[PDB]
CSV table of C-alpha atoms in Angstrom, one decimal:
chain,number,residue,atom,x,y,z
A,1,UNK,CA,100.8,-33.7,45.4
A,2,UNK,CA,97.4,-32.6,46.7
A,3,UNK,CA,94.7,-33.7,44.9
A,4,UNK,CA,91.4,-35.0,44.9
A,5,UNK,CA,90.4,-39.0,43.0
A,6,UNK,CA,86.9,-39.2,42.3
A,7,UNK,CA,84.8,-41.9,41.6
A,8,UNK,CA,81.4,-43.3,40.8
A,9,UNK,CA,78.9,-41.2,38.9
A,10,UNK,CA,76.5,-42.8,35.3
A,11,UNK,CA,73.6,-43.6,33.8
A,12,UNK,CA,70.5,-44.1,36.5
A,13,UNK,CA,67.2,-44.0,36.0
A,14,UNK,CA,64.8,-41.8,37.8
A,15,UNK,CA,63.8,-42.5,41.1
A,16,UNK,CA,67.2,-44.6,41.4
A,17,UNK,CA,70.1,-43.5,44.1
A,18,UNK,CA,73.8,-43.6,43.8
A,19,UNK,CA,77.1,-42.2,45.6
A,20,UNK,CA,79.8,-40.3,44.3
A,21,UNK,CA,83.4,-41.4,45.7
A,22,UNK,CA,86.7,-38.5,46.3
A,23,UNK,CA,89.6,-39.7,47.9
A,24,UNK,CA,91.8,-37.5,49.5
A,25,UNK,CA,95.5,-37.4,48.9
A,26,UNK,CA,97.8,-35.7,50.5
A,27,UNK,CA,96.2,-34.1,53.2
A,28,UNK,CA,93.6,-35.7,55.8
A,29,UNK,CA,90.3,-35.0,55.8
A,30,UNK,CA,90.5,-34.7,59.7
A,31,UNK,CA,93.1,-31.9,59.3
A,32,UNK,CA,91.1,-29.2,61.4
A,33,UNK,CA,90.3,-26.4,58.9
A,34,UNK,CA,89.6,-28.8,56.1
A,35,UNK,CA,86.2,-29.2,54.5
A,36,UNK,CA,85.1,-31.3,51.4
A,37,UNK,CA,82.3,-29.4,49.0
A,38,UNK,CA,80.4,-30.8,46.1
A,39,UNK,CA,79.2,-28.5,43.1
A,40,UNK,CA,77.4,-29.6,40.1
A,41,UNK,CA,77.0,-28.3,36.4
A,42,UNK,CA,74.3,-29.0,34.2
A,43,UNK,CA,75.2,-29.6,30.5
A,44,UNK,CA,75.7,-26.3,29.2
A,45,UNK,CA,75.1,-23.7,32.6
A,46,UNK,CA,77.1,-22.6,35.2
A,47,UNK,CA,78.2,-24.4,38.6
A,48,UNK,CA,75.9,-25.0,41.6
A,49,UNK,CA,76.9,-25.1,45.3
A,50,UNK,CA,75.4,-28.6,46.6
A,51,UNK,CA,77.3,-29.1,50.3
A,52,UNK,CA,80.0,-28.7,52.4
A,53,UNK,CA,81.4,-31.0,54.9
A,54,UNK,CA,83.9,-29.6,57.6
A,55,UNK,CA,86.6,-31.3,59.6
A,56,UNK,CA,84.5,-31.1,63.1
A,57,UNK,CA,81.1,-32.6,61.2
A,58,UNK,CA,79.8,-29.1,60.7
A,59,UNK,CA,77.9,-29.0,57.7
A,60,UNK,CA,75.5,-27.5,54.9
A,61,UNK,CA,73.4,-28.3,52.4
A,62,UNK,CA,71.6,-26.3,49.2
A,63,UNK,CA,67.6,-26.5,48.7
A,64,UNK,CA,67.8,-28.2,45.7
A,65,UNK,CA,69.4,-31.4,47.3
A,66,UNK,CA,67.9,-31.2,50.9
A,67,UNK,CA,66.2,-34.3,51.9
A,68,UNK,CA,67.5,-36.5,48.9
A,69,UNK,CA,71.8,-35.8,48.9
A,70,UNK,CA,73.9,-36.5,52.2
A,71,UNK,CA,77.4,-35.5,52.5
A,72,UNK,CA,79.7,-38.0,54.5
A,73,UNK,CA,83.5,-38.6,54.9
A,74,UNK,CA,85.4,-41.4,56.4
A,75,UNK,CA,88.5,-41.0,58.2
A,76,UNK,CA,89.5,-44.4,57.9
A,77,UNK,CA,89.3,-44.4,54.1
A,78,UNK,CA,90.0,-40.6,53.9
A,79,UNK,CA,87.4,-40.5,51.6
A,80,UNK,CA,84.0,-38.1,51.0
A,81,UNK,CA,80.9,-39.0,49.9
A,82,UNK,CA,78.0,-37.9,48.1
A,83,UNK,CA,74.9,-40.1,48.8
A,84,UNK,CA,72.4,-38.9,45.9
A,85,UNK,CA,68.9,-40.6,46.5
A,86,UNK,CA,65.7,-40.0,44.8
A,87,UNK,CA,67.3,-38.9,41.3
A,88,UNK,CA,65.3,-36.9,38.7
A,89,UNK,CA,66.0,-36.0,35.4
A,90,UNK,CA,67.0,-32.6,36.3
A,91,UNK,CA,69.9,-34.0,38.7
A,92,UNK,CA,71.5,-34.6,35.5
A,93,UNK,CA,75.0,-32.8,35.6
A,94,UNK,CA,78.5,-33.2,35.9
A,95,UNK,CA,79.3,-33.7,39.8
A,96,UNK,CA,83.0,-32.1,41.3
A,97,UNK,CA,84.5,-32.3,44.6
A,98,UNK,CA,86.3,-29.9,46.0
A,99,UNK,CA,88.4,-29.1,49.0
A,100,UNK,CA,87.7,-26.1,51.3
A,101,UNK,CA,87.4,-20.4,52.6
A,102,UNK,CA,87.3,-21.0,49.0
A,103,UNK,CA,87.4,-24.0,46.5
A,104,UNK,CA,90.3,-25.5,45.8
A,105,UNK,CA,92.1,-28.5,44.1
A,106,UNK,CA,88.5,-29.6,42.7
A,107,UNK,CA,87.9,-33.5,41.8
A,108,UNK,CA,88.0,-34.1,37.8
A,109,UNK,CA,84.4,-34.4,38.2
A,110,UNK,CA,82.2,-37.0,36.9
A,111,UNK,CA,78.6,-37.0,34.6
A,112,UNK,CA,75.5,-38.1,36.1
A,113,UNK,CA,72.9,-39.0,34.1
A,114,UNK,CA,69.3,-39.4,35.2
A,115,UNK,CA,67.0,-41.0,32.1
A,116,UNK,CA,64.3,-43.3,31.8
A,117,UNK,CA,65.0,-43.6,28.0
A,118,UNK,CA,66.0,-42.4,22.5
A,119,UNK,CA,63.7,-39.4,22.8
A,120,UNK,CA,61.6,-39.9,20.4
A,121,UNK,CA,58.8,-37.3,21.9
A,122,UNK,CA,56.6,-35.6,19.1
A,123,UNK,CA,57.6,-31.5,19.4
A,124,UNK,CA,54.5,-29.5,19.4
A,125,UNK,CA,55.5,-26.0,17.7
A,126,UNK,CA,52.5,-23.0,18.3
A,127,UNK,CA,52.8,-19.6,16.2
A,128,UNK,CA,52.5,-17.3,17.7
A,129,UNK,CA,53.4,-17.1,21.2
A,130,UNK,CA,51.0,-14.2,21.8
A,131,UNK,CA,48.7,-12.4,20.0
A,132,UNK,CA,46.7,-9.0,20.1
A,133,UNK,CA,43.1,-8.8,18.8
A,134,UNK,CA,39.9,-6.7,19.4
A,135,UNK,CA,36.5,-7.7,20.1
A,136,UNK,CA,34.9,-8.8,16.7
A,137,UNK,CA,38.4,-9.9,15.3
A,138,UNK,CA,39.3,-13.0,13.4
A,139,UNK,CA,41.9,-15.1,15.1
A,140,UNK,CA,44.2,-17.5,13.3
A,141,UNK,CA,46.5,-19.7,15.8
A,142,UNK,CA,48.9,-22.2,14.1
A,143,UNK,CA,50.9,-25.6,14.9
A,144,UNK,CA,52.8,-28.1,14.1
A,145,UNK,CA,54.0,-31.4,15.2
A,146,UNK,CA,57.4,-32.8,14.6
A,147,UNK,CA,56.1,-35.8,13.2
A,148,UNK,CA,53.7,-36.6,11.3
A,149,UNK,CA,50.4,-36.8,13.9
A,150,UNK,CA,47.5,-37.5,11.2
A,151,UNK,CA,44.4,-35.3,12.8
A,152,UNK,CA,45.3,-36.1,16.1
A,153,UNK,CA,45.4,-32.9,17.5
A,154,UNK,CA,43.5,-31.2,20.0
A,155,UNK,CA,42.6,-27.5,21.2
A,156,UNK,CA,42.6,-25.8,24.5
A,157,UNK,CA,41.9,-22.7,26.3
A,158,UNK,CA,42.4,-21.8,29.5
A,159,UNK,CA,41.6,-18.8,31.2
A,160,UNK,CA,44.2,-17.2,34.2
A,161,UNK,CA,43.2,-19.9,37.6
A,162,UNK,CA,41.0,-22.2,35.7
A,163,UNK,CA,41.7,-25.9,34.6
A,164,UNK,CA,42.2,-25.8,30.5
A,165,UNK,CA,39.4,-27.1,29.0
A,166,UNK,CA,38.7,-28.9,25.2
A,167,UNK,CA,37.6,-26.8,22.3
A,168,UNK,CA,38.3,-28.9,19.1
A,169,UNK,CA,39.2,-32.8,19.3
A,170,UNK,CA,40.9,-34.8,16.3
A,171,UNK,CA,41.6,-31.5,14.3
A,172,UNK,CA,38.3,-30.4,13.3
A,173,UNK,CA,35.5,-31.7,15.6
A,174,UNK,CA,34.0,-28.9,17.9
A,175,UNK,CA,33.4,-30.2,20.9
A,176,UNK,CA,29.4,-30.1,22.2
A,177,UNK,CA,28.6,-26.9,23.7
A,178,UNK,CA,31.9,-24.8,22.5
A,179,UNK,CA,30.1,-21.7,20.2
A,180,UNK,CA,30.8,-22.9,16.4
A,181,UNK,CA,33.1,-19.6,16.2
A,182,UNK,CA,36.1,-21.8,16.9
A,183,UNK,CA,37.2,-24.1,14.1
A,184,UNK,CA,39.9,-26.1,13.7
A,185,UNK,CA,41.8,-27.3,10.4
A,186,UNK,CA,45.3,-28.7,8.8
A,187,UNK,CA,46.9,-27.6,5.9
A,188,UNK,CA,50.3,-28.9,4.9
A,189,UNK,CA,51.7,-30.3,7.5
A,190,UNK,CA,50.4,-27.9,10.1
A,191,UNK,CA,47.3,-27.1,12.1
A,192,UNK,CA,44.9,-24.2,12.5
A,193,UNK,CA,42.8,-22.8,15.2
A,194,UNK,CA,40.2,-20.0,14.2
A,195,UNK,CA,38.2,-18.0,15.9
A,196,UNK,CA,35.7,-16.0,13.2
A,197,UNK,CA,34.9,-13.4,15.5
A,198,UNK,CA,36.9,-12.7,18.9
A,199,UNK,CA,34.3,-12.3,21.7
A,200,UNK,CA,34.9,-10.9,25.3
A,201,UNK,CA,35.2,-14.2,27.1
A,202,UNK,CA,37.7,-15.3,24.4
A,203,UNK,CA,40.6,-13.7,25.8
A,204,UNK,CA,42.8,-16.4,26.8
A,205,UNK,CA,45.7,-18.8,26.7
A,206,UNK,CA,45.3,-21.5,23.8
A,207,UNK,CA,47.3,-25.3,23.6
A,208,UNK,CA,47.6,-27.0,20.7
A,209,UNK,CA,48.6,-31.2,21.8
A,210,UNK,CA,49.0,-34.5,19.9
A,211,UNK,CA,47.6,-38.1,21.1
A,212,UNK,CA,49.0,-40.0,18.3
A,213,UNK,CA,51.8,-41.4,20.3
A,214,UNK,CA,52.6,-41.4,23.7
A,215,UNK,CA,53.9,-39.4,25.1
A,216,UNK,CA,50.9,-37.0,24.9
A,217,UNK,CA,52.7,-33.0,24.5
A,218,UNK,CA,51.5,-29.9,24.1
A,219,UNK,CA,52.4,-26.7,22.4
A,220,UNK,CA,53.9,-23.7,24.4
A,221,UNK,CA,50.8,-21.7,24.2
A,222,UNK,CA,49.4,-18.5,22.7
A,223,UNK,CA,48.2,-15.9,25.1
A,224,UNK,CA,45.2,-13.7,23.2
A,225,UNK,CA,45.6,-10.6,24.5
A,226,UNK,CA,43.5,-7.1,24.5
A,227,UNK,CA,45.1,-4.8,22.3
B,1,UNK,CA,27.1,-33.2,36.0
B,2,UNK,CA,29.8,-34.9,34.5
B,3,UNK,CA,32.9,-33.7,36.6
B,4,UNK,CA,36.0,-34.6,38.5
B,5,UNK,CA,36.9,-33.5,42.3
B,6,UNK,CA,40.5,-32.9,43.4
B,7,UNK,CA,41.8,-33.0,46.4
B,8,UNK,CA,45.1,-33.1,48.1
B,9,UNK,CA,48.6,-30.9,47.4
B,10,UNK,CA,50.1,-28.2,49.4
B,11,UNK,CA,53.9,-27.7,50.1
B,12,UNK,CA,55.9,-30.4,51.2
B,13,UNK,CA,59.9,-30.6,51.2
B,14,UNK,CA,62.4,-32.1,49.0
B,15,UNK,CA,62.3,-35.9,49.2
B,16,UNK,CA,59.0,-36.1,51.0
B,17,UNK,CA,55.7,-37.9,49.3
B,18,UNK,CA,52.1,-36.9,48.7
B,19,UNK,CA,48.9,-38.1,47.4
B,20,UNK,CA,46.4,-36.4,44.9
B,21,UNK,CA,42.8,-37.7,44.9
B,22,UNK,CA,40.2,-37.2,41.9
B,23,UNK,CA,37.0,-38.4,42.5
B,24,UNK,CA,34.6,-39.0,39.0
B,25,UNK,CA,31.5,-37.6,39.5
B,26,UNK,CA,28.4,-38.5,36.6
B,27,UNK,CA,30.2,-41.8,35.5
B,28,UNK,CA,32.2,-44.8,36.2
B,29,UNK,CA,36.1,-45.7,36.0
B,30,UNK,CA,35.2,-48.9,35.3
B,31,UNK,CA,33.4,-48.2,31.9
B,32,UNK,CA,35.1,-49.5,29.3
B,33,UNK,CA,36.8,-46.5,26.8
B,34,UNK,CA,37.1,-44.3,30.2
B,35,UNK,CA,40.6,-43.6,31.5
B,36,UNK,CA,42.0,-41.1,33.7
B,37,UNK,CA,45.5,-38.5,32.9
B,38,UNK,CA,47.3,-36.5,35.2
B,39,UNK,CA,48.5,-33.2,33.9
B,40,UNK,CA,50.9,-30.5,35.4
B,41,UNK,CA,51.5,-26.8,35.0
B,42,UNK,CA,54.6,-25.0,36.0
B,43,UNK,CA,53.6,-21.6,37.3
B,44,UNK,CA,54.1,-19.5,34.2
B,45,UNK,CA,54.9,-22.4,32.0
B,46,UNK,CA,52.8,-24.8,29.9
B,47,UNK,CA,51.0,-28.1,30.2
B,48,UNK,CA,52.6,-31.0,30.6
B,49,UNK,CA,51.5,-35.1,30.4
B,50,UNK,CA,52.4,-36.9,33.6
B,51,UNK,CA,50.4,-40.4,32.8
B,52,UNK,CA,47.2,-42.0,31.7
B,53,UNK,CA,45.3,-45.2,33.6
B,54,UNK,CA,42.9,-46.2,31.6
B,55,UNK,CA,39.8,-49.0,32.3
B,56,UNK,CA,41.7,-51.9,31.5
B,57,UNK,CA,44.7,-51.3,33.5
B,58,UNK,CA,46.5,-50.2,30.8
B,59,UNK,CA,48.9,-46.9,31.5
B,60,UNK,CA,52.1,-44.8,30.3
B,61,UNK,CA,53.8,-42.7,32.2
B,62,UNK,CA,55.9,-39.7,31.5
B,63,UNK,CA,60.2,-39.5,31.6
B,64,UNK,CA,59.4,-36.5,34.0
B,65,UNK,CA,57.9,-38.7,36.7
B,66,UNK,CA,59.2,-42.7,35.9
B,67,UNK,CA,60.4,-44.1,38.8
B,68,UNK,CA,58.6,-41.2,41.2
B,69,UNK,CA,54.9,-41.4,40.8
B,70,UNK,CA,52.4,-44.2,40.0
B,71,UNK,CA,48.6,-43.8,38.8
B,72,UNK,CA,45.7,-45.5,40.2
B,73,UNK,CA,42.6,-46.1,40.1
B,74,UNK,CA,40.0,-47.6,42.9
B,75,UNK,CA,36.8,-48.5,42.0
B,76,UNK,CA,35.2,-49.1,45.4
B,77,UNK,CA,35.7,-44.9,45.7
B,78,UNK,CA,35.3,-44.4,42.2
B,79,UNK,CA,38.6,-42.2,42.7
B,80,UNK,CA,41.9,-42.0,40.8
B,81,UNK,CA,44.6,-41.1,42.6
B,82,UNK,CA,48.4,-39.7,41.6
B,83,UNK,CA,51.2,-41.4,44.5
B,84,UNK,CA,54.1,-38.9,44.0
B,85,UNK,CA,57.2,-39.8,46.1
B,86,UNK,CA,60.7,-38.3,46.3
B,87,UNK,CA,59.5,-34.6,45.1
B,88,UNK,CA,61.8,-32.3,44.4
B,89,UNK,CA,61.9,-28.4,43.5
B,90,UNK,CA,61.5,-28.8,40.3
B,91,UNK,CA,57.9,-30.9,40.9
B,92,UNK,CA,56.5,-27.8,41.8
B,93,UNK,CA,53.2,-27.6,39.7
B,94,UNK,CA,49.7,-26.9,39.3
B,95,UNK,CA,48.2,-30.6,38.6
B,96,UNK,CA,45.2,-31.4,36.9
B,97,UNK,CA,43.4,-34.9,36.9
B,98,UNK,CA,41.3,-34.8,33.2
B,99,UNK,CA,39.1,-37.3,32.2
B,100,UNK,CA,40.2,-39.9,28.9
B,101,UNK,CA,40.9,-39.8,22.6
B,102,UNK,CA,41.2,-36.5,24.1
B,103,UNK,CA,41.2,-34.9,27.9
B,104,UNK,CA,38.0,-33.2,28.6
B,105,UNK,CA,36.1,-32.7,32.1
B,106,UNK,CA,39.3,-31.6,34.0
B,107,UNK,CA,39.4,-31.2,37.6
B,108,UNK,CA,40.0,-27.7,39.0
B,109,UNK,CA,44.1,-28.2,40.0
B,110,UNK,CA,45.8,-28.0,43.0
B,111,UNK,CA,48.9,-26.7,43.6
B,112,UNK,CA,52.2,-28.6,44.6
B,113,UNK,CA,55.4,-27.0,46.4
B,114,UNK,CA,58.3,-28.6,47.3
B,115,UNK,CA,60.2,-26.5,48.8
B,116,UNK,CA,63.0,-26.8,52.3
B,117,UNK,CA,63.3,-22.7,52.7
B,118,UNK,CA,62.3,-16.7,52.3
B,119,UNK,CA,64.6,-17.2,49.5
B,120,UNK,CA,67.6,-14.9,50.9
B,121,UNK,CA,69.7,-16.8,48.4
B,122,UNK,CA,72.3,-13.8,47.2
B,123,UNK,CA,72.5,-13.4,43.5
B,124,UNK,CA,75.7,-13.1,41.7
B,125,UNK,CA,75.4,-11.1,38.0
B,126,UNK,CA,78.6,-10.9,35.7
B,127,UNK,CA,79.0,-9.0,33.0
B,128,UNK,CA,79.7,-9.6,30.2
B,129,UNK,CA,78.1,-13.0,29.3
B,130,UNK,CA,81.0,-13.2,26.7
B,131,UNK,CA,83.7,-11.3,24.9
B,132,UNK,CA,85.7,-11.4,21.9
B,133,UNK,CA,89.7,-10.9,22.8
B,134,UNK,CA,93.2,-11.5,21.0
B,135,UNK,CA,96.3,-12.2,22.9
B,136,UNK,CA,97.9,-9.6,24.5
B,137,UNK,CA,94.7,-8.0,24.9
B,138,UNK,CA,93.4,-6.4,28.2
B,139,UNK,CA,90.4,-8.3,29.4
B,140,UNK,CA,88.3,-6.8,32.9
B,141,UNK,CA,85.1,-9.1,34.0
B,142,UNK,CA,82.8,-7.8,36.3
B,143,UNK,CA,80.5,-9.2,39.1
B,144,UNK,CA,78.0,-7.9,41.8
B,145,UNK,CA,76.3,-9.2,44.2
B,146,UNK,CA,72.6,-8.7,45.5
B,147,UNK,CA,73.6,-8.0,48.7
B,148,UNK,CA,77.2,-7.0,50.4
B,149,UNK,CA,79.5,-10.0,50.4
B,150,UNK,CA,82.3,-7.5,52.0
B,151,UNK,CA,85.4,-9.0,49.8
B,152,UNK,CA,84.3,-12.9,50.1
B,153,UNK,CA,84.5,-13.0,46.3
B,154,UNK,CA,86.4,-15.5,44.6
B,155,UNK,CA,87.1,-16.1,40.7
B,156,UNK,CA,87.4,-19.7,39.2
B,157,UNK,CA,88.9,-20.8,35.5
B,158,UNK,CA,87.1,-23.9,34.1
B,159,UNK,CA,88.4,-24.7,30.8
B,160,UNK,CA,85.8,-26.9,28.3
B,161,UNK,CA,85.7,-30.9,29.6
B,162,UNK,CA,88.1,-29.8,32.6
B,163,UNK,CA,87.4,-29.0,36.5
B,164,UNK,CA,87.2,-25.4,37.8
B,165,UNK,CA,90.6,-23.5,38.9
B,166,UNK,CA,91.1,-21.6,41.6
B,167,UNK,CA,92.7,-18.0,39.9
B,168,UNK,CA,92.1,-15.3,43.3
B,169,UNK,CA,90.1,-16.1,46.7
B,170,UNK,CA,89.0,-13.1,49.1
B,171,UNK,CA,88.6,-10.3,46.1
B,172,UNK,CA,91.8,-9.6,45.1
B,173,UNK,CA,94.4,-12.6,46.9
B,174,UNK,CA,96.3,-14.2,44.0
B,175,UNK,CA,96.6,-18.2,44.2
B,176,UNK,CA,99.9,-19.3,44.5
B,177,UNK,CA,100.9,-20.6,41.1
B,178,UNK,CA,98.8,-18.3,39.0
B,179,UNK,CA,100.7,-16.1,36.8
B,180,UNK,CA,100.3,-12.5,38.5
B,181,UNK,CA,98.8,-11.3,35.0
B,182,UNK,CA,95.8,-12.1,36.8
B,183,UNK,CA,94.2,-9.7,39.5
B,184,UNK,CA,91.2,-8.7,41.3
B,185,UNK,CA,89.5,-6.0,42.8
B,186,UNK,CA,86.8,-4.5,44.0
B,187,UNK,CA,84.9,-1.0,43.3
B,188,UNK,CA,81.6,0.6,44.2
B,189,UNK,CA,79.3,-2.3,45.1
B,190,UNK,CA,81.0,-4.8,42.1
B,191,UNK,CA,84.0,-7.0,41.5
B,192,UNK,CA,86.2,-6.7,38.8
B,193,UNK,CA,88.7,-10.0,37.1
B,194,UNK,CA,91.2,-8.6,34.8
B,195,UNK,CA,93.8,-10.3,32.3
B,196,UNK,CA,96.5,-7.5,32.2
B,197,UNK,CA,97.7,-9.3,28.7
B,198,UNK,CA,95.6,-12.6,27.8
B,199,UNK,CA,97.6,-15.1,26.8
B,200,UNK,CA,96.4,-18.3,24.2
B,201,UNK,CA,96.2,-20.5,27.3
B,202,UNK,CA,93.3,-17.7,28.7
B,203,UNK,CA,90.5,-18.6,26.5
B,204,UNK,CA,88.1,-20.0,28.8
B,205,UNK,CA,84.8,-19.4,31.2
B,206,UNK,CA,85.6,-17.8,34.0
B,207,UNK,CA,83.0,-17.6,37.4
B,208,UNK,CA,82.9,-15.1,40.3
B,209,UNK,CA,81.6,-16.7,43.5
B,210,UNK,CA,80.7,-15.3,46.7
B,211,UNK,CA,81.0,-17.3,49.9
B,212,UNK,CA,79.8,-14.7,52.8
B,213,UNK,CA,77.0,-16.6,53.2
B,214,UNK,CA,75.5,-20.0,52.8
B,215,UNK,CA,74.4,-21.2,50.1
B,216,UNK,CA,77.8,-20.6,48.4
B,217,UNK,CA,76.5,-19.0,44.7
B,218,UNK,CA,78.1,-19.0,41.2
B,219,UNK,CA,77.5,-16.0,38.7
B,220,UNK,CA,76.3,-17.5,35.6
B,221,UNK,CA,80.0,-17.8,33.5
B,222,UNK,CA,81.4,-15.4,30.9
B,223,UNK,CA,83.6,-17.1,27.8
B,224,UNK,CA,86.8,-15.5,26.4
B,225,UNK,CA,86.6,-16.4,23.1
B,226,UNK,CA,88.8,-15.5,20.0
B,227,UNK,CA,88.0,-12.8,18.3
């Protein structure tokens, strides 16, 4: 029987490194014409070409792993490896081996899971995600947290190549030298941002973001656009 | 002026390391209340919290960056400073340093890259995403590529929880053990899969994949489901 036995795989944490084990059996690894190729598949998505390792040490790897993965076999074990190093969370995925030019009698594949902890983080919610206005128009943008944030909730604008920069801070309070056309406020269980009358330099991108818990998040945005 | 003054970024590669500087300009690190945050923007995407040092060496750090990058501070520069190590492609970001409870005063962003390679990756689009079939139905899947592959095409089986299956390598070659209900081919610049008559055991997500040229690429799945 041909087949691949893989090995190895869990729960790291980011930054951490670990190797995925698949032992060959029935065939060498040496066999000229053989190679050994990892793919990965993120929970939910498609598969991803990672490397391939050849019989005479030829080998390639994809952008996304280069620098952090190396792909190794050992004749002696007839065994390949996947050295992963310098995890993130987005290395999260189930891992397969696979031998050989197409891929065939693939490893049963194993979950790697790259978390630092849960997830308890506060979903910021902004309505809506763009907008059209006129000069002179008034402007409501809305939010709302997932949890209950008390007035901690601030307002941003940033402009296409500039740094965001603060507008209202704990719900209501305009910050010094913003033009008291924005106002901020919170109904039932949601925030507002106003702008009375839309002025030229208003067009923007705005961010809605709670500080009553770490982590700090932000809403997706609303772009203000010319109509 | 009250302001902050980045430095550092550029484009590094997978795995490598870099340090951002932000120097406080009009006031102190050390005051008491002050703290620094590190903020990152994907290009087209929103804001996101990296970390927060504040005066009394108190700090949090994001998930996204646990493990990966620490925050600093050095009062003998008055600078704050971002050490990001192992970057990969998904670190790529315009990052903000923003003064303390809300972030106002931010610095002007610099861009980060991490990147090993252009982009001459070739795209593989099927069609459909999904379909509704009964047994005994005929099913035909499609697939192109965004460049010629010639007939280096082949099409995989993955059923859900279990490892991809090899069903037909180099367009239209049948794996041995397949049941010949199964066939491929190959029209005007696209790739066709067809079921002849799908049987219950067919329900699955099937993947075309070309391998003409490193890196091998996947198209992104289509389910046979029941109707």
């Amino acid at each position: 029987e041909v087949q691949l036995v893989e090995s190895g795989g869990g729960l790291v944490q980011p930054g951490g490194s670990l190797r995925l084990s698949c032992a060959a059996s029935g065939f060498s690894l040496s066999t000229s014409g053989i190679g050994v190729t990892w793919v990965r598949q993120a929970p939910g998505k498609g598969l991803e070409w990672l490397a391939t390792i050849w019989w005479d040490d030829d080998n390639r790897y994809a952008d996304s792993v280069k620098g952090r993965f190396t792909i190794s076999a050992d004749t002696s074990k007839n065994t390949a490896y996947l050295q992963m190093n310098c995890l993130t969370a987005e290395d999260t995925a189930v891992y397969y081996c696979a031998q050989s030019s197409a891929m065939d009698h693939w490893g049963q594949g194993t979950l790697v899971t790259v978390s630092s902890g849960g997830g308890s983080d506060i979903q910021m919610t902004q309505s809506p995600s763009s907008l059209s206005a006129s000069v002179g128009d008034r402007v409501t943008i809305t939010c709302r947290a997932s949890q209950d944030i008390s007035s901690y909730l601030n307002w941003y604008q940033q402009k296409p190549g500039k740094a965001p920069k603060l507008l209202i801070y704990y719900t209501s309070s305009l910050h010094s030298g913003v033009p008291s056309r924005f106002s901020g406020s919170r109904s039932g269980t949601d925030f507002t941002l106003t702008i009375s009358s839309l002025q030229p330099e208003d067009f923007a991108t705005y961010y809605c973001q709670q500080y009553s818990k770490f982590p700090w998040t932000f809403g997706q945005g609303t772009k203000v656009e010319i109509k």
